[PDB]
Ligand binder design. Sequence first.
Ligand SMILES: CC(C)(COP(=O)(O)OP(=O)(O)OC[C@H]1O[C@@H](n2cnc3c(N)ncnc32)[C@H](O)[C@@H]1OP(=O)(O)O)[C@@H](O)C(=O)NCCC(=O)NCCNC(=O)CC1(c2ccccc2)OCCO1
Ligand SMILES: CC(C)(COP(=O)(O)OP(=O)(O)OC[C@H]1O[C@@H](n2cnc3c(N)ncnc32)[C@H](O)[C@@H]1OP(=O)(O)O)[C@@H](O)C(=O)NCCC(=O)NCCNC(=O)CC(=O)c1ccccc1
Lengths: 379, 378
Amino acid sequence: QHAKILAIGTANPPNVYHQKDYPDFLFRVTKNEHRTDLREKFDRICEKSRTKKRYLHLTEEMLKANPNIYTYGAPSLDVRQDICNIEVPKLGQEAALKAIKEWGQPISRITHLIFCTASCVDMPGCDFQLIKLLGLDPSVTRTMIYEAGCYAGATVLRMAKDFAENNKGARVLVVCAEITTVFFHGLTDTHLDILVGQALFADGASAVIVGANPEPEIERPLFEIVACRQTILPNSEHGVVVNIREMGFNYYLSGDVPKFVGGNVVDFMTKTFEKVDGKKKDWNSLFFSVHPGGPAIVDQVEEKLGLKEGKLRATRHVLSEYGNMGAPTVHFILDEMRNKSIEEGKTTTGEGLEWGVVIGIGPGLTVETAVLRSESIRC
Amino acid sequence: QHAKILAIGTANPPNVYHQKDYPDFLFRVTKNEHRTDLREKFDRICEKSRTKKRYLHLTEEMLKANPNIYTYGAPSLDVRQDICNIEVPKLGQEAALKAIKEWGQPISRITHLIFCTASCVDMPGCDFQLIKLLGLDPSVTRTMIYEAGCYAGATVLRMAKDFAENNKGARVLVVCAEITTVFFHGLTDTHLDILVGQALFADGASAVIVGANPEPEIERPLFEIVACRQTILPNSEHGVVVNIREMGFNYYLSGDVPKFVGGNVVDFMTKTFEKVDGKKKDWNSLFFSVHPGGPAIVDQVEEKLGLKEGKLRATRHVLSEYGNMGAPTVHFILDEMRNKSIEEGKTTTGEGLEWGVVIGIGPGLTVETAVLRSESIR
Ligand SMILES: CC(C)(COP(=O)(O)OP(=O)(O)OC[C@H]1O[C@@H](n2cnc3c(N)ncnc32)[C@H](O)[C@@H]1OP(=O)(O)O)[C@@H](O)C(=O)NCCC(=O)NCCNC(=O)CC1(c2ccccc2)OCCO1
Ligand SMILES: CC(C)(COP(=O)(O)OP(=O)(O)OC[C@H]1O[C@@H](n2cnc3c(N)ncnc32)[C@H](O)[C@@H]1OP(=O)(O)O)[C@@H](O)C(=O)NCCC(=O)NCCNC(=O)CC(=O)c1ccccc1
């Protein structure tokens, strides 16, 4: 009896930033309107981003009050942490309450908590703060995953699987929450990576309830977590780097990340499915939740796996409507898949298909995959 | 069946700071010799520390080169991180090679890695760096535990147990490593908590190999990880606080932490052993690895569990010879227990007893317990 996803909830900050307006906003609020050179490059990036809108906690008023946040390299970690250490658990709480509602059980049945964020760090951590906010049992068994990055949407499912399968009756609340205030940086032609993050990064939280042996008439599985694999792509340690510094969380993004993903996806998919049935081709038989680190990563997975038009629609839909929210994004994609599957009258939560995969991609470059089975659409 | 500890290794930085000399060192190198009031308080704390010496990466030359590190509140996180992001994986590598030697299997047999540190944070993380240093399989399944704090020596055993028990043949390398350079702060009469940290905190790393179903005649278990429990002690959120700031990892320590531990130990011990057995436990029938966050915490466990003289000898020995190294410390204590049991000709790795417990204590206040069984000395 494998671990099942029993519920998914999601949440975002209330402020909507449409991409058509974000260049004007960013360059105005950071006092960079003279950098017409950088505005051209940012317009081009936004045009290619395949991101139509994003939800952000950050507001213009916060920047006016804390201009060090947009002053490249200036000390600002403390004010960023003061915000994010509060806002990340709060946004997580909202998602968790939605997941718990779907699940339909009392909060007292939660035995385990996984909290994941790359947006802040504190002791006690976000997990402790969420226990207070939700009134979880003080003896919940906790895993606090700080600063893992964009593969961790798959990683937390892998951890949840083992915790749920090895501890009979366990019910695991998994919460991934990101507030990108800590990553916001001003504009300099010495660090153009920032233009890419400014176009793509976004705020959001997911919550997933994981458990084996669903209770009949109460619990309803959405997906089954079958098998998982984590690997490091060769010769790519420069792909995604984040340093936690006095200036905030500083990041570097190699232009070659999409090529590394494309050059490795057939291998890492094949090695993942060796843990199941030895599948080695015909990837269109699967449903997919691909972490949309950027649009070129999505395009590379589609091209090198030979995916048909529309196979990655749910992934592209979330990237369009929410941007890259980090680890929660693959859970938004699973939720979107489930919702569209209901809308279309599909037989399962995975677009009618039986087997699928979650692909998380982050620093290392590290790829974690989770092979899923869908479930019938019921109650 | 149950996950077993198959090996334990430990490591420390090479610089030894005898406590008798540390007040003179601290006040000289931080330019605080004029604060005789603070010196008097620090002498008193050191005298009560029950810590005879500590190993530290930090040197006087480092402080001279980076005086912001001892200038209270000055921006210094970047230099601290530049040191600790390198030094934490290196020290962990030393411990891991020792554990791997004891275990006696190829590095390529390791399927899972847990790395734990509260001394730094970076992306990719320490786990990634250790994979490079050791040549671990690039597909090892990793868990990177940043900034949990002093309960995590028990937490990582709980995590390793689930990974080892749910994945047939899995072999988990667990590495905990701490370099307290990130926590070093100068002295101000507005933040006297620093005097306690300056007296007690120390550097070290542990490595443990965990697996279920040890191979007969090839692997040999030291302890069995039977059951685990994590809990928050009521009304103690202020007990231990660490904020990751421009000035480094700043910390606050409540004077009530020992009383909180003593006020809860019977309960958290009872609730933990109820996961194993319905009979009442005799606490003196156990062997103990207690996180020595300070000497008063050890005294509180001894008192409220009614432990006989000497029951906590191994714990107190590590506190005396190494100080509070954070999460690794309870693993140093298990290693010390195993070593002393060999020396004394005991029948088991747990002082000749069958059942034991690891008690980790940290922010929340959070207590994680792991129930252990000993193994025969072979
Ligand atoms: C960018 C683009 C859309 C361009 O569109 P394209 O269609 O590809 O056009 P291109 O022909 O390639 O050139 C287009 C023009 O942009 C220039 N350009 C393109 N790339 C780069 C570059 N890397 N550096 C410099 N310049 C670049 C190029 O030089 C050219 O400039 P030009 O026009 O002036 O000539 C495409 O490439 C793409 O999807 N990239 C994948 C992005 C990627 O890695 N995401 C994963 C990373 N995740 C995190 O870090 C996670 C997180 C976090 C946390 C919490 C919440 C949210 C996140 O943050 C830190 C830690 O956690
Ligand atoms: C601290 C001792 C030995 C004191 O000796 P004592 O108990 O025998 O007599 P005392 O009269 O109490 O002390 C003498 C004088 O110091 C004052 N005073 C005492 N306690 C104070 C406090 N807590 N605050 C503030 N003032 C305090 C007191 O007021 C008196 O003042 P005086 O009148 O002399 O001027 C003991 O209490 C004790 O074990 N406490 C438990 C310590 C504890 O919880 N550690 C948790 C560890 N946390 C971490 O995070 C670890 C970490 O990062 C790390 C990361 C990586 C690597 C390694 C580490």
